Structures are given as structure tokens and as C-alpha cells.
From Swiss-Prot:
Entry protein name: Protein Vpu
Compartments, record wording: Host membrane
Assembly: Homopentamer. Interacts with host CD4 and BRTC; these interactions induce proteasomal degradation of CD4. Interacts with host BST2; this interaction leads to the degradation of host BST2. Interacts with host FBXW11. Interacts with host AP1M1; this interaction plays a role in the mistrafficking and subsequent degradation of host BST2. Interacts with host RANBP2; this interaction allows Vpu to down-regulate host BLM sumoylation.
Gene symbol of the encoding locus: vpu
Family: Belongs to the HIV-1 VPU protein family.
Record note on modification: Phosphorylated by host CK2. This phosphorylation is necessary for interaction with human BTRC and degradation of CD4.
Function: Enhances virion budding by targeting host CD4 and Tetherin/BST2 to proteasome degradation. Degradation of CD4 prevents any unwanted premature interactions between viral Env and its host receptor CD4 in the endoplasmic reticulum. Degradation of antiretroviral protein Tetherin/BST2 is important for virion budding, as BST2 tethers new viral particles to the host cell membrane. Mechanistically, Vpu bridges either CD4 or BST2 to BTRC, a substrate recognition subunit of the Skp1/Cullin/F-box protein E3 ubiquitin ligase, induces their ubiquitination and subsequent proteasomal degradation.
Length: 19
């Protein structure tokens, strides 16, 4: 769901961003 995406999307983006 929208929440799931945000969680993962935010997790990935945030993570991927980190390194």
C-alpha cells in the first residue's frame, strides 16, 4: 500500500543515498 511504498521507498532512497 501507499504506506508500504513510503516505508520501503523511504528506506531505500535513504539508504541508497547514504551509500
Amino acid at each position: 500500500a501507499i504506506v508500504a511504498l513510503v516505508v520501503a521507498i523511504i528506506i531505500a532512497i535513504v539508504v541508497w543515498s547514504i551509500v
